[model samples]
Target chain A: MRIDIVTIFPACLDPLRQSLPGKAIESGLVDLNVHDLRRWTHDVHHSVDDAPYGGGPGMVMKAPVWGEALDEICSSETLLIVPTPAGVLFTQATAQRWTTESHLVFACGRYEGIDQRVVQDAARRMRVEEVSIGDYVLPGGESAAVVMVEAVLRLLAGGLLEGPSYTRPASWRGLDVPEVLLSGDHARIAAWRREVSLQRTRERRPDL
Target chain B: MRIDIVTIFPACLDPLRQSLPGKAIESGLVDLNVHDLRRWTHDVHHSVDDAPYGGGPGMVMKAPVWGEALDEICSSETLLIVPTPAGVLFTQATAQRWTTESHLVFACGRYEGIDQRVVQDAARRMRVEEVSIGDYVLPGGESAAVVMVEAVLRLLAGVLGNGLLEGPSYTRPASWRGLDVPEVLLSGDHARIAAWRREVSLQRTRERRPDL
Candidate 1:
């Protein structure tokens, strides 16, 4: 999978490339690139933001530079994922659906938001999705992108494999590993594991 | 506000030190620190994870090392935040709550999860919360910490003061980058602009955020 992130502060995205996502990118399992919105600017300030059309406090990201960036970065098959508070809730299902695609373009907005017209226009050419990581406002989409790429990377079969794991020192501070697991009885262990998973989820997140 | 992150992969957090969060740290407004979970381990390998109590697909984090890390990193005033799928939803209100805290310690878990006992034990000594950023699950709590920190700091004094307003924007760059700005939007037509904004904004919000 290929992901292109367009943001003014490109350094914020370095964490994604420095972590597990890095391993995936290095292994050629995920092709990831971070782009700067300023690259498309032609002004002396090279500003990517401007005053809102209707009165607002913070600046709204301009549509022209974004229009230029999207035109150069996007292709027909790309799925444009923009992170904002005014977007669809991002989920495991969303990540799973995106993993199947060959390319993903993330437009990380800062300040008030991107010009609605930019997204409206971009929608005409490619599939555009506005996704909010959580029900909270953020400084930018960079960190949200970090969490998103991790969810997407670990799911890929091509990268390093991770399954249920256990380690040494089974008993620590009088807290012993479950007796059933230690018993080495395959049937009983599987039964206990299923029961525990259900019990944990029910108690912690019944809403799930 | 002081933020502490305890994780196995410390380098993954390096980028955070170079960004806005970094500015907060340098300005002394937010004393941010990342500690390696391995430092608390006592064994030859200094391993931080152990087998699960029940059979599972992934290893569960050991409780003892986490206990040690928390003991050293946390004080009586510290608020402990854990990231997981099986936890209360994280939201703007959650960020609002943390912004008032003086110290925040994030205990990041890997594999399947940490033993529930770890958090239960921490709760006896300090305020503890398990927060899930979204409906999805990632490889571990490290990235979730990144998301949480961004949310939390953006609402505080040390970080960028995000304006509580939003509106459509236009491009004024070279002519090559032009797009239509509805005639009604530009016409000093407050009535027409208000009409277009109301219709488009309401419809957009419903399609993107049903809960809102």
Candidate 2:
């Protein structure tokens, strides 16, 4: 798989080099590229943002600069992901589905957000998705890209592979690994694990 | 506010030093610290993981190591955030509430996750919350920590933030490849500009995020 990330703060995506995504890249299973969005700017300051058209407190990322970047990086087969709080929620299901795609291009928005036309225009040639990793806002989309990329990287076929795992000292600080796990009775242990997970999902994450 | 992150892969949190969190640190609004979890391990190899108590495909982050790290970093006043997939959802509401907190410490669990006992024990003193930033599994808690910290940082009083699906913004070229900046935005009429933005915000939210 090939993943391309374009952001003003390319340094923010550096974490992709240290964990699961890094391992995938090392193994030749993924090709990851981080691009500085300013590279495409034609002006002296290489400005990526301008005052909002409708007048807002924060600046809106300009459209023209983003246009040039997307045109150069994306092909018809690319899945262009734009991280925005107002977009569709990106969930595990999206990560699962994305594992099968050959290429992904993430445009990390900053300030108010990228000019809306950037995504609207890019959709004409490639698959475009404006996704939100969560409900909260951020200083920029770089972190969201880091979060989404890590989630998807771990799901690939050879991806590094969840559940609360407990390690030894059968008893530690008044906490004990469930007795079933230590019984050496595989059937009972499996049953206990499933039951505990079911109960946990029901109580704390029923929505899942 | 003071924030500390304990992670096996400390480099994963380096982004914190490059963005808004960095700015906050520079301005003295937030004291940010990233600790290598392995530092708490006593083993010669500095091993942080071991075989799961229950048979599993992966290693479980040892509880003792995490226990020590938490003891050293957190106080009764700290709100410890453990990023886990099986935890409660984190949202804008959570970010807003966290802004007033004076201390936040994030424990970034790796492999199968920090031994369950780590969080259960820490809860006895300081506030503890296991949070999932979104409905997805990550390689480690580091990325989720990044997402959560960024969310919280932007909400701080001096920070800039967003939502409501901002409408299309045009600049310089009024007619860009034939698409024009809507006339109302440049009208110098605040009322019409506000009205136009509202219509677009409502329409886009309805079309893309009906849940909102």
Candidate 3:
């Protein structure tokens, strides 16, 4: 898979080069690049944002800047993802679906957000998805992109969501590493883990 | 606010030093520090994780290592936040409440997760809360902490969520920057921007985000 991220705060996406995502990039499983959104700006200040037409608190990312960038990077096969609070909630299922995409372009908006027209126009050429990581607000889409990328890359790596973990020191301070696990009974250990996982999931995430 | 992040991948949290969070840190409104969880390990390999006793796909972070680190970093007043998929969903309200905290300690677990007992033990000393930023799973808790910190610091900086935006090039690609916006938003003109905002919100929420 090929991933391209355009953001004013390019450094904020630095986490992509570390840990699991970094390993994925090194293994040649995904080709990911981070680009400075200002590269497309044609001005003395190299500005990528301006005052909102309807007046607002923070600056809004200019439409033309995003237009130029996405025009150059996107194709019909490309999926343009714009992260925003005013979008669909992203979930594990969203990440799973994205793993099949051949190429993805993430427009990481800062301040208020990229001019709505940027997304409105780009939808004409390729698939445009506006996603929100959660109900909360964020500094920008950079971290959200970092999150979505991690979620996708992990699925690409292939693994199950392992259950709760316990380590050495059969007894620690007061807690023990669950009696069933240390009993040397593999069947009972597996059964106990399954039960714990279900019960924990019910307590924490009833929706799941 | 003073914030401490304990993680194996310390570099992953570097984004905190840029943009809004960076601005908040520079103004001395918040004291944030990232520490290597491995620093607490006392082994030749400096290992901090081991195979799960119940036999899982990934390793479980060692409880003793976390115990030592949290003991040193957390105080009675510290609120320890552990980011995990199996935790309470975090929202804007959670961010707003966190803004009132004096200190926050984030344990960014990698692999499967930190030993669950670690959180159980730490709760005896300080406030401990396991929070999931969203429904999706992350490689670790580092990015989730980054998201939460941004959410809180933005509130600390004080500002309302401005509605959608449009900028220069009044006309581009046969598209005009909303006729209402060009009408000059002020005083009585506020009604126009308000109406446009309502119309845009209604369309976007109803069309793109049905849940909202």
Per-residue lDDT tens digits for candidate 1, residues A38-111, read 99999899988877654536677887788899999998888998888767789889888888989889899887
How well is each residue in A157-184 modelled by candidate 3, as lDDT tens digits? 7612335678887888798888898888
Q: Candidate 3, residues B1-212: lDDT per residue as tens digits?
A: 99999999989999999988899999999999999998999999999888888566878899999999998999999999999887888989999999999999999998889888998899888999999998888889999999999899989877766433222222222333332234434334777767766666677776765655
Ranking by lDDT: 2, 3, 1
Per-prediction DockQ comes to: 0.44, 0.63, 0.54
Tell how far residue A53 is off in model 3, in angstroms: 2.4
Question: Cα deviation of B183 in candidate 3 (Å)?
Answer: 7.9
Ordered by DockQ, highest first, the candidates read 2, 3, 1
Better of 1 and 3 by lDDT: 3
Best by DockQ: 2
Report how far residue B158 has shifted in candidate 2, in Å: 2.0
Between candidates 2 and 3, the one scoring higher on DockQ is: 2
lDDT digits (tens) for residues B37-152 of candidate 2: 98898879999888987587888888899999999999999999999988888998999999999999999988878888898899998999989887888888988988888878
Task: Mark the regions of model 3 whose C-alpha exceeds 4 Å error after superposition.
Answer: A158-163, B160-188
Q: What would the TM-score be for candidate 3 when compared with the true structure?
A: 0.91
Would you list the clashing residue pairs of candidate 2?
Answer: none
- Chain A only TM-scores, each candidate in turn: 0.90, 0.93, 0.92
